[PDB]
Design a binder for this molecule. Sequence first.
Ligand SMILES: Cc1cc2nc3c(=O)[nH]c(=O)nc-3n(C[C@H](O)[C@H](O)[C@H](O)COP(=O)(O)OP(=O)(O)OC[C@H]3O[C@@H](n4cnc5c(N)ncnc54)[C@H](O)[C@@H]3O)c2cc1C
Ligand SMILES: Cc1cc2nc3c(=O)[nH]c(=O)nc-3n(C[C@H](O)[C@H](O)[C@H](O)COP(=O)(O)OP(=O)(O)OC[C@H]3O[C@@H](n4cnc5c(N)ncnc54)[C@H](O)[C@@H]3O)c2cc1C
Ligand SMILES: CCCOc1nn(C(=O)NS(=O)(=O)c2ccccc2C(=O)OC)c(=O)n1C
Ligand SMILES: CCCOc1nn(C(=O)NS(=O)(=O)c2ccccc2C(=O)OC)c(=O)n1C
Ligand SMILES: Cc1ncc(Cn2c(C)c(CCOP(=O)(O)OP(=O)(O)O)sc2=O)c(N)n1
Ligand SMILES: Cc1ncc(Cn2c(C)c(CCOP(=O)(O)OP(=O)(O)O)sc2=O)c(N)n1
Ligand SMILES: Cc1ncc(Cn2c(C)c(CCOP(=O)(O)OP(=O)(O)O)sc2=O)c(N)n1
Ligand SMILES: [K+]
Ligand SMILES: [Mg+2]
Ligand SMILES: [Mg+2]
Ligand SMILES: [Mg+2]
Lengths: 582, 582, 287
Amino acid sequence: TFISRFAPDQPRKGADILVEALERQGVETVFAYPGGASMEIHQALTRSSSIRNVLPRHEQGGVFAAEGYARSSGKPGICIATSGPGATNLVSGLADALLDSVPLVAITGQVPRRMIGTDAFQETPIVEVTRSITKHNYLVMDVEDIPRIIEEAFFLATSGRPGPVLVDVPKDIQQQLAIPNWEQAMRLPGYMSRMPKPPEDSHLEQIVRLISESKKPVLYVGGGCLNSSDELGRFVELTGIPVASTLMGLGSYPCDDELSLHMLGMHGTVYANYAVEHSDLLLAFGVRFDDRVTGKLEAFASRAKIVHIDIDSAEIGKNKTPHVSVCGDVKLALQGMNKVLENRAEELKLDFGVWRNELNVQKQKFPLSFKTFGEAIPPQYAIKVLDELTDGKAIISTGVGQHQMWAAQFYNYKKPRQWLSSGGLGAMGFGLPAAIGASVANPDAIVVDIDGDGSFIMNVQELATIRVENLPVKVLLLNNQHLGMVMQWEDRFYKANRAHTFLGDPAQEDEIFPNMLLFAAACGIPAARVTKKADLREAIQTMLDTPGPYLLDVICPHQEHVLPMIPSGGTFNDVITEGDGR
Amino acid sequence: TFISRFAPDQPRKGADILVEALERQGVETVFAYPGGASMEIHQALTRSSSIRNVLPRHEQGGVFAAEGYARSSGKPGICIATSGPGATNLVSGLADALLDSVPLVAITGQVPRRMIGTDAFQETPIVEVTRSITKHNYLVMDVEDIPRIIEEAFFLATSGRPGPVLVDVPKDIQQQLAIPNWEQAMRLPGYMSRMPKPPEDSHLEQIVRLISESKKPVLYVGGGCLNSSDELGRFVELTGIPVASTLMGLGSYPCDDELSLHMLGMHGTVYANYAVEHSDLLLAFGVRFDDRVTGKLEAFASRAKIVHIDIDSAEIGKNKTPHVSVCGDVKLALQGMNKVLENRAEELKLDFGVWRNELNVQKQKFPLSFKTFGEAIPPQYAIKVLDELTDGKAIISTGVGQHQMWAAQFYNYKKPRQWLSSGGLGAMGFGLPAAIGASVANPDAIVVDIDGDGSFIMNVQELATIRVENLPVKVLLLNNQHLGMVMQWEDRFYKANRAHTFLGDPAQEDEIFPNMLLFAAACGIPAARVTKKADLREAIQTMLDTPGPYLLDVICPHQEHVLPMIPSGGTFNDVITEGDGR
Amino acid sequence: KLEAFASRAKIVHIDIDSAEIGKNKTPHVSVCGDVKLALQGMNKVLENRAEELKLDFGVWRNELNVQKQKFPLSFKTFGEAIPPQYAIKVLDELTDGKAIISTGVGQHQMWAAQFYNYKKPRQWLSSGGLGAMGFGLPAAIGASVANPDAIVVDIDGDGSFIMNVQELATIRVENLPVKVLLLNNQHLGMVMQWEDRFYKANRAHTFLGDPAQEDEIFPNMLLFAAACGIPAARVTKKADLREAIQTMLDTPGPYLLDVICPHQEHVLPMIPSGGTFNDVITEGDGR
Ligand SMILES: Cc1cc2nc3c(=O)[nH]c(=O)nc-3n(C[C@H](O)[C@H](O)[C@H](O)COP(=O)(O)OP(=O)(O)OC[C@H]3O[C@@H](n4cnc5c(N)ncnc54)[C@H](O)[C@@H]3O)c2cc1C
Ligand SMILES: Cc1cc2nc3c(=O)[nH]c(=O)nc-3n(C[C@H](O)[C@H](O)[C@H](O)COP(=O)(O)OP(=O)(O)OC[C@H]3O[C@@H](n4cnc5c(N)ncnc54)[C@H](O)[C@@H]3O)c2cc1C
Ligand SMILES: CCCOc1nn(C(=O)NS(=O)(=O)c2ccccc2C(=O)OC)c(=O)n1C
Ligand SMILES: CCCOc1nn(C(=O)NS(=O)(=O)c2ccccc2C(=O)OC)c(=O)n1C
Ligand SMILES: Cc1ncc(Cn2c(C)c(CCOP(=O)(O)OP(=O)(O)O)sc2=O)c(N)n1
Ligand SMILES: Cc1ncc(Cn2c(C)c(CCOP(=O)(O)OP(=O)(O)O)sc2=O)c(N)n1
Ligand SMILES: Cc1ncc(Cn2c(C)c(CCOP(=O)(O)OP(=O)(O)O)sc2=O)c(N)n1
Ligand SMILES: [K+]
Ligand SMILES: [Mg+2]
Ligand SMILES: [Mg+2]
Ligand SMILES: [Mg+2]
């Protein structure tokens, strides 16, 4: 039974109604940057003893933190911003959450209702702007609609295929006195009627039939399996089917496991892409057949019967047409199939040992590899050392680029929601704020931001947030003084012609610029720099052992190329296994 | 006669066509951050020997720099971004340019045409997102449309009421070989038919008639007069009518001049607001009657015949209904009236000396003022010292907040386009990037960013840009360890109840956090901190005399309130003249 | 009710629009493409493996034939009054099922779909998704222009017919051999039917005649045709119906036959909106 700070017959500001509405949703943390149109809400937050605000230094840092909070917990991330420039600063975060299907509730303050449309002070039509980059949005036009809309916003953001929901609240609504009704019904008749039914036995039995008739099955696992860790593991035990994950599905199945084919796709392992290429049965669970994964669609799993289980019916048949499909929760589908696979285990002598052996040969002949040049630090090796010293139990947020791929390749995530990374949009400056949200959601966990020097500096101001909030965020900065991935594409497609990809100072080429150690020192965060590979292990150990925030500046050669690589729109036969920028 | 780097019959990439299109517009500088969807464009830029790229460390820094470039020169600002996260990072800048009517051309890369709408890698529907926050936007669907669209984009951005125009260019279009036609006609028949005619003598004579029949005339000057400095000055000489400017119109008429009433509005001078309040003739030239200026509309210039000259017909009669209006260029209107006022000078014995004397009494009894507490540095005084040491000839960019108002109040701008500030949207983090664009456009000028500690840290990463580009940008940081303006509103409307407005470290309250000196040192930028008022003059002098970039950290008391203040939606009788947070 | 529709069946869906596959019901097997090409591909397989696949659904077909025997399409004949179902059945016989049929929307639309056996596609022209009244007569015009040598008949209701009655002028001017079989019940039939079953037969603006002269047929559709120089006639007795339709067909050029029908007729059988097969209604009218 919920307890309000107000009497049931006592009028109160809309802002106080809005905050209590969040309290009734179980919200414990918000990421809010104060402004004129949202001052009432901020005043109401201070009256709440259950909701804590983490003040960012930029709204983009705020919304990215809410994403990290959401991705690392499964809870919806909540960020609050003011009108105008505050609201527009959320846009990259909203788009990011929509593409990666992250549950997010964003509340923006707005000018008074009568002032809307008059080009008023700090006014943007944020609902118009964000309509195409959110799952849904609202413009509250009356104080009595606040309880209903907030409830609908959280329901829409967390149910079905998760996504961002924005609620725009005019300032006069926040100031109006009213008595809220919490027993009101949601106005979502269309959405609720299209909510997927629990998976029928008819479809589940069809899948099990295909499994027993296959000889080269492959699991194609993605972000939709992040809540099905136990069920997926049980499924693999009963079938023995090897598992290949997407960038978004890392950790759903243990990467260090014997049946793990690791990541597939453009920068996936050779044996993972091989498995899909030669499979006769593709079990696509919680994926959306992205172009980074498939390449040329007609060549992707061309010899396989495709099974697709997605909670979004619009995804089923979008890029590739499945022979068998299930529209519903993959968690429930796995549970249903596990019961059948267990009761008919003796009847179904499932043994794909020959197929698994064939893949093990590919894993032996084409493993993930890297070179060690003298005493220079291989970024791949640095991440591998972090894995060992954290025992693969750390929460890892990254930026976007070469370091992002290496963090996905050379760290073996044992559980889901350890891996926090911008996949669909691929937004730089995501790593540091996401680590903040993750550390807030997981106070006792080891949180490490594996970042690049280009992505790190984009939201470097959030270092202030980290110190003020006393968050034990570790920053493993892989510094190559360049925009790595773009530089890599320059080497292969533009004859290594440099077009604004150097991030240092041309006046002092060999000097590391900027000095990231001084950024950390500015915010009272202890830092160090390692250059020699021999000193790397002790340096990372120091970063972990030192209580509180820490920045380790790891200097890396910029000639490194991410391998292997399947060219955009290419096939498995177009895979590149050797080459760099030397 | 323009000279191309290609033969008239030689096929070339769309990216090369796009860059030459910019060259034919006289573009010398762009602000571009490279990404996959815009790599072709960046490759094409390196082949250009006339166009220089300033690489920012964040796209928001890039677009804000393009604004500073535009505001300080009158030329269109050009920024280029990649698809997805790059494009969404421009949004705050686009909205900012639209509200302040700043000429801006933003070019974004886009995924291949066939890939659009499929939730592809790094894809955002940027045209949908930015439709309501740009003057116009385009999606190029064929390489042959590039010359026409680019020409239209620059025409729309710079003609009539200036504004931002976004052009989205799919990657396959950039790669396609074609022979461009530069002799093609623009498809803007509606827009060009609605372009205001040159002002008729009929309307101009009506205004002159009103002037000769008035006894208390006041000039209400805004951003529309930024190109009419000479004409406005001539007008004032012939009439003797006192001048009151908006936040956007500072410098159009010399602030240090005898007939200058300085700024009016919410934080305008008492005598400026008094003049408008008791005027019988209000000459509204290049303004839009914003709520920051008028307050309660029915009380604004209630006893005055209102003359409104605006190039946007949609602005004439929007908030207040004018008795006399002219839809056209205020520059041309001034020229027409000056000829009449000169030829009929003896006939029209214009003398508003009695009215001017009445205002001089108000200027004597209610001047701009501030207190000096011990050795603590008054921010108002710091800005006043900067004025003296730069002889009022410096280019000033600011953030948003208390320091923004003091920079507008206590610096006397002698010419237009010295004052660069976000007025309509009021976006924080604008100051530093805008100074960058201004310094690029004006290499020999004194560029100073008067910033607050909250606004400064938002785009602090652009310090790297400043050092790399070797720009003589001076940073006058007014550090009060708080969000000043919000804190001020807390004191007056919420019983000084603090709601996340402290920017320092609560663990070390008296320690200045963060250490901004170390941010500058990280980017190799010389810096210093002044705390005692006695040492302030020498410190600012050092900042100016030291060649290259410089950061001066000025410590200020956070108890200061911006005065005078007319409450939002209030009248002149509601003006507040005394009070702070002590 | 979707959950009850083909609940015991494995569903195969072949559609050229991928957005349709899985929209309402989730298929076990699907093909996104031209059904014409899919049929061609399957026919080759079904022919080459005919001996291997001893396909025989004779038992299932026999089970359905029993249902076809016990629950066939039916109608009553009251005295000499003309059953609309019968009128359409006579048209079928006299045109040998080779005529192009356009209709309006309502009861007559359903009877035209039930009691005429179309032998080829594109004989049946009717507004299905939107169900727009006033469609019949103009559609017949377009059909007659596209098919100059065909027998084009507009089976219309008095409500739908009058909505675009002005196109009678078009028919005469263009000299199109459009036949109009007007089923006149003086009411909006289908709405009237729903009134009888869901609103206790409470009439809410469903009568199309003149309340001052209830038993007089209003309006006089014969005079609409005469206004546009189109030969017309009216039949009331069922005995005279066969000769009347024959006259309509044999008379060269446009023709309007005004068939007077009892308004108490209900379209059967009927499954209520959002209902299941067990909710099917087989008997009842408005008498
Ligand atoms: C620089 C860079 C390189 C990249 N290269 C690669 C690469 O090499 N390999 C790679 O895989 N990715 C790569 N990506 C990431 C890629 O762009 C996509 O983010 C990713 O491939 C798509 O993830 P997904 O297919 O698992 O589906 P997601 O984006 O994670 O979406 C989840 C899907 O499952 C469904 N779903 C959600 N919940 C449920 C549920 N409970 N039950 C059933 N279904 C559910 C959803 O409807 C959705 O369709 C890269 C990204 C970047 C920035
Ligand atoms: C914290 C803060 C406090 C503020 N307080 C104040 C304040 O106290 N006082 C104040 O004045 N502002 C204040 N503002 C700024 C305010 O919000 C607006 O930006 C400003 O008042 C509007 O400027 P403007 O009226 O001159 O018109 P602008 O926004 O500058 O637009 C120019 C107008 O002139 C027209 N125009 C353009 N070119 C021409 C031409 N060639 N010929 C004719 N017409 C043309 C345009 O159509 C347009 O209508 C504040 C902003 C902030 C962030
Ligand atoms: C220098 C003064 C600017 O500072 C502020 N102005 N301000 C307000 O002006 N608040 S307000 O309700 O009356 C308002 C009125 C009209 C248009 C917009 C607003 C608005 O909500 O802007 C945030 C407001 O809330 N703050 C903090
Ligand atoms: C780790 C690989 C990601 O790096 C890159 N991918 N990439 C591309 O993939 N370029 S691309 O034309 O073929 C493309 C194809 C499909 C969808 C989107 C795009 C696109 O333009 O994204 C920028 C591209 O241009 N870069 C730099
Ligand atoms: C905001 C933004 N801008 C541009 C890009 C495009 N982009 C860019 C510019 C990358 C380089 C990132 O540089 P980094 O130093 O942070 O990391 P790496 O050196 O490991 O690549 S990665 C990539 O795809 C992006 N994803 N997001
Ligand atoms: C991006 C953004 N967020 C919030 C606001 C709202 N806002 C905020 C938070 C201000 C305080 C600025 O703090 P500062 O330290 O930079 O400057 P002052 O201390 O002089 O006010 S000013 C103001 O109106 C804004 N204008 N822009
Ligand atoms: C233009 C329009 N209005 C209303 C309807 C709704 N409606 C109406 C009013 C029908 C009655 C049609 O009357 P009718 O005389 O033409 O045919 P029947 O008597 O055989 O029903 S059928 C039906 O569903 C419609 N389909 N189209
Ligand atoms: K930043
Ligand atoms: Mg790098
Ligand atoms: Mg401050
Ligand atoms: Mg009828």
